[PDB]
Design a protein around this ligand. Structure first.
Ligand code: IVR
Length: 161
């Protein structure tokens, strides 16, 4: 069902993540981590302290789709490991956030054409730069459009909250 998902999304904040390649999204799905540029790392660290859930909604550039969404489980941390990101430098991708995936399924942009983002001039929610915040109502509805991911149990995510 969608009840636990709605509970996780309650009062959440949402950010669009735009990746240049599929490989880093695949690596993020396998290892539960994400890294971004310092402008956005600063924004996400602020958001993580400010909200019960911070949701990253991923889209690979030129794919015409979102590739899923995940909840931040930590602020960014340095050292830890050298993630083999297919770097589009490595020093700008230090700072690793831990993330718990909520949905690893794809959603085509054609399915979100009815959703506009107030924080980006009411452009369709697919439009935005890496790090663009998505207002609560639009982000909630976007996440609810994804196909359910029955391989994921939200019970442990609710306990992180
Ligand atoms: C693992 N993290 C990332 N991996 C990839 Cl392949 N692209 C990213 C990532 N974070 C942001 N972008 C998009 C981008 C690429 C290059 C210059 C500026 C911007 N915004």
């Amino acid at each position: 069902g969608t009840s636990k998902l709605k509970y996780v999304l309650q009062d959440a904040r949402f950010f669009l993540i735009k990746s240049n390649n599929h490989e880093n999204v695949s690596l993020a799905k396998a290892k539960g981590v994400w890294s971004t540029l310092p402008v956005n790392e600063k924004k996400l660290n602020l958001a993580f302290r400010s909200a019960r859930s911070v949701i990253l909604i991923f889209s690979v550039r030129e794919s015409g789709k979102f590739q899923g969404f995940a909840r931040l489980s930590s602020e960014s941390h340095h050292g830890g490991s050298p993630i083999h990101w297919v770097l589009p430098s490595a020093k700008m991708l230090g700072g690793v956030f831990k993330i718990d995936w909520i949905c690893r399924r794809e959603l085509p942009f054609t399915k979100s054409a009815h959703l506009t983002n107030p924080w980006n001039e009411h452009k369709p929610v697919k439009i935005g730069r890496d790090g663009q915040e998505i207002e609560l109502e639009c982000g909630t509805q976007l996440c609810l459009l994804f196909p359910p991911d029955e391989s994921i149990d939200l019970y442990q995510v609710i306990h992180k909250m």
